[PDB]
């Protein structure tokens, strides 16, 4: 099973300036809970965005997708395409595609689940922003309640599965 997991503003932004333009501790915890013990597949720019104590993401098999065959990525497995990332020599019952926008677009046709955090934060998109994928009629989902973070933002989790 191949799942995507992301957090987006209601406006659809996932990334800006090499990071994530809000602070949502409940989402970091959600991400860690869902992914721990599993494979996490990411694009090279997302690998480069990980803060020091999270590069590699502890307790998970980190797979980095790049066209730079010689790339050094200590703590991760480097592969040359998304298809390679999803064709491991050692299978995993759960593989999560963890971003970014480029890789989500390639992975969406191959996935059967999306776990989405929606963040009610006013962020008019800017020209270099990374944006969330859009789920069409081949997906259906369920939504948790709107919650308020201890740090102030309204957020909610959605779970989608391929019809
Ligand atoms: N909010 C969230 O849930 C979330 C999650 C993850 C990331 N982010 C944010 O999103 C941003 C990064 O996303 P992004 O869209 O810019 O980049 P990305 O998807 O993480 O990485 C793009 C890179 O992947 C590689 N790649 C893309 N297509 C490929 C292909 N067909 N074959 C091989 N390699 C391929 C290339 O690496 P090379 O250039 O090395 O060849 C490319 O530059 C950051 O701001 C990050 O903080 C947010
Ligand atoms: N729902 C959701 N899906 C995602 N694919 C996602 O990006 C995951 C890649 C970026 O990871 C981080 C970036 C900065 C600080 C910590 C981490 C992960 C730490 C760990 O797990 O050890 C996020 C963002 C979660 C963090 C911000 O709240 N959230």
Q: In percent, how helical is the residue content? A: 10-25%
Give the C-alpha Rg: 15 Å
Strand content: 25-35%
Order of helices and strands: EEHEHEEHEHEEEEE
Sketch the major β-sheet. 9 strands, mixed
First CA to last CA: what distance? 14 Å
- What is the overall number of helices? 4
The overall number of domains is 1
Overall morphology = globular
Going by helix content, strand content and strand pairing, the class is alpha/beta
Secondary structure: number of strands: 11
Q: What hetero molecules are bound to the protein chains?
A: NADP nicotinamide-adenine-dinucleotide phosphate, the ligand Nc1nc(N)c(OCCCOc2ccccc2CCC(=O)O)c(CCCCO)n1
Binding site for NADP(+): 7, 14, 19, 44-46, 66-68, 100-103
Protein name: Dihydrofolate reductase
GO biological process, one term: folic acid metabolic process
Function: Key enzyme in folate metabolism. Catalyzes an essential reaction for de novo glycine and purine synthesis, and for DNA precursor synthesis.
